[PDB]
Amino acid sequence: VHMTINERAGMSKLVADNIIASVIKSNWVVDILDIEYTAEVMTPSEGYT
Amino acid sequence: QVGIPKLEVDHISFSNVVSMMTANIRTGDDMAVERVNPDDVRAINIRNA
């Protein structure tokens, strides 16, 4: 299942947990469009900080 | 003939079949929920019924 979540709000925390669990055990691909984020491109020498 | 209702007539009957639960109905597993509030108060759609 390629589930799309246009907006997280009002979601049960148990349901969000169950969805991530599906992402892992059923290989769900879940695209959360609500999120905004900045990115940093680490060099291999610095690793994930 | 079918049996006359006990409440139909003026006799007193000192034995009757009382329906009853086998055990206490207050198990103690009271229902509990997860209320989860609107994210933005401005964003709420009061409209449409």
Tell me which residue of A22, A12, A42 sits closest to B34, measured CA to CA: A12
Burial class, A16, CB count within 10 angstroms (exposed 0-12 / middle 13-18 / buried 19+): middle
Contact B34 A11 (CB under 8 A): no
Give A15's contacts in chain B (Cβ within 8 Å).
none
Cα–Cα dist B10/B44, whole Å: 64
Torsion of CA B39, B42, B45, B47, to 10 degrees: 160
- Report the Cα B2 to chain-centroid distance in Å: 32
Confirm or reject contact between B23 and chain A (CB < 8 A): no
Give B38's contacts in chain A (Cβ within 8 Å).
9-10
- The approach used to solve this structure was cryo-EM
Confirm or reject contact between B36 and chain A (CB < 8 A): yes
Resolution in A: 3.1
